[PDB]
């Protein structure tokens, strides 16, 4: 059962994937911090 449940959960998530879904400000802040760390080391 749960294999089908995971399958359909991914389906119903990807269908609402007009981008990163329900991420929040932490999404952007952490990504920017990591990117700027990459810049500092690159």
């Amino acid at each position: 059962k749960l294999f089908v449940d995971k399958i359909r959960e991914y389906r119903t998530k990807r269908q609402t994937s007009g981008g990163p879904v329900d991420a929040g400000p932490e999404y952007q802040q952490d990504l920017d911090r990591e990117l700027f760390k990459l810049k500092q080391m690159y």
Binding site: L2, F3, K6, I7, Y10, R14
Partner: protein, 495 residues
């Protein structure tokens, strides 16, 4: 993304009928389990939190199980499932280039280990018939180790010395030097190095792996890291995991080299493991078992005869001695288990004489056997000359005495070396030849290093034909000796 969904399917969700037990009391790193009626001794039970444990004590009413992780992830009342197999580890050529922890769980990223075979960490050493005398040479690429205190394949040398005297450096140079053999044509000179890091800072092992990847040396190395933070029952087990990953090669006709670094920090993990079991402490609080612990581990570095595949497993235990006391408990426990020893003085090291091998005390009890004939010719003289120099260096008259002093100082300056700079055997032969036959007695000792460098850059560039002749015919013939003498004389002239 859909890659992850494929990651979902194909997972084994089948349920099986499995025996089980209930934890009674977890504390001090030894869980007590109730049940597990049909559990074998030294079996690998699995807790409910994904941990693992080795069924250690089969008492009538419970099972003392040593946890292979942090015992804070184990409750009282948890469920312990027996996996029905004595403690195993994954072995194969699928591990080469992978940093696996003490149980074969890749701590590397880089996907999982795709191994198809498992060995038992608690196997037994080969008996007396399978073994054969040590015959083949293990090239360390270090002039002092390769000339004076050579090593063979099947031998189990020891590297013993204080804090920061260059033991890990010798190990890493030995690992790196094998790169040339591990590219040639014959599978008979390929050495598959292993490196067990026991109770070592994790950053150290990370940088060591980075260094081994710079030198293209991870194509054959396996790093089995049970670092400082890891629970004691993992530092105790890591050497046996590594020794099994090496026994696989040894038993399948190949050649392996395993470096335990350190074994003075496995015995400390074992002393913790014991005193927490209430076992009666002995000399220095070590259990009386602390010998069998190392004897059983180092007795597997065998050299199987040709009727048993012909493989081999060299071992290079690294002991660390406080204040350079070679007569402590563990140092002597191990000095009576191994076939040799390399003492790394901490005052030779502080003089800039690196690597700091103390050739007075170092020895290899297979020694001249399993040494290239060329190096034997060149280095027997060096051994005698260094002996004579040592006999007299306690004061600083006649012609012979001053001659001994000068030749010995030249040779000492000649045996220094730099890090991550292993030298082919023929290069060592050439340098020590130019040193011992006496084509350096006029040059100032302080310059002997520069000469060395320059000389190499010459010989490697111009006369590679002679070096190939020495390598192929592992011996210095008379014509080769004459050509080499000409080369040395001519080069020294222009200096």
């Amino acid at each position: 993304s859909s890659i992850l969904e494929e990651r979902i399917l194909g997972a084994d969700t089948s349920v099986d009928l499995e025996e089980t037990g209930r934890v009674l009391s977890i504390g001090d790193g030894i869980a007590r389990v109730h049940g597990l009626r049909n559990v074998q001794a030294e079996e690998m039970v699995e807790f409910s939190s994904g941990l693992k444990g080795m069924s250690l004590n089969l008492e009538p009413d419970n099972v003392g199980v040593v946890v292979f992780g942090n015992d804070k992830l184990i409750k009282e009342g948890d469920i312990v499932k027996r996996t029905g197999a004595i403690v195993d580890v994954p072995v194969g050529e699928e591990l080469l280039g992978r940093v696996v922890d003490a149980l074969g769980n890749a701590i590397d990223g880089k996907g999982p280990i795709g191994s198809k075979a498992r060995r038992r960490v608690g196997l037994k050493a080969p008996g007396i018939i399978p073994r054969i005398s040590v015959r083949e040479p293990m090239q360390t690429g270090i002039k002092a180790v390769d000339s004076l205190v050579p090593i063979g394949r099947g031998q189990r040398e020891l590297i013993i010395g204080d804090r920061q005297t260059g033991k890990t450096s010798i190990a890493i140079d030995t690992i790196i030097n094998q790169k040339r053999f591990n590219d040639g044509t014959d599978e008979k000179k390929k050495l598959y190095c292993i490196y067990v890091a026991i109770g070592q800072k994790r950053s150290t092992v990370a940088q060591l792996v980075k260094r081994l990847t710079d030198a293209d040396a991870m194509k054959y190395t396996i790093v089995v890291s049970a670092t400082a933070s890891d629970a004691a029952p993992l530092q105790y087990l890591a050497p046996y995991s590594g020794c099994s990953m090496g026994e696989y090669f040894r038993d399948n006709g190949k050649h392996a080299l395993i470096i335990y670094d350190d074994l003075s920090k496995q015995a400390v993990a074992y002393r913790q493991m014991s005193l927490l079991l209430r076992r009666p402490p002995g000399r220095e609080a070590y259990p009386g078992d602390v010998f069998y612990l190392h004897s059983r581990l180092l007795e597997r570095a065998a050299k199987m005869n040709d009727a048993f595949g012909g493989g081999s497993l060299t071992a290079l235990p690294v002991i660390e001695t406080q204040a350079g006391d070679v007569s402590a408990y563990i140092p002597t426990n191990v000095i009576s288990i191994t076939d040799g020893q390399i003492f790394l003085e901490t005052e030779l090291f502080y003089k800039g004489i690196r690597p700091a091998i103390n050739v007075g005390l170092s020895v290899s009890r297979v020694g001249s056997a399993a040494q290239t004939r060329a190096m034997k010719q060149v280095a027997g003289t060096m051994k005698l000359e260094l002996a004579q120099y040592r006999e007299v260096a306690a004061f600083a008259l006649d012609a012979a005495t001053q001659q001994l002093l000068s030749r010995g100082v030249r040779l000492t300056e000649l045996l220094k070396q730099g890090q991550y700079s292993p030298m082919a055997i023929e290069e060592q032969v050439a340098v020590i030849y130019a040193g011992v036959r006496g084509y350096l007695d006029k040059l100032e000792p302080s310059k002997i290093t520069k000469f060395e460098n320059a000389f190499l850059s010459h010989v490697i560039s111009q006369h590679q034909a002679l070096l190939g002749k020495i390598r192929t015919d592992g011996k210095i013939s008379e014509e080769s000796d004459a050509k080499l003498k000409e080369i040395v004389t001519n080069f020294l002239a222009g200096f």
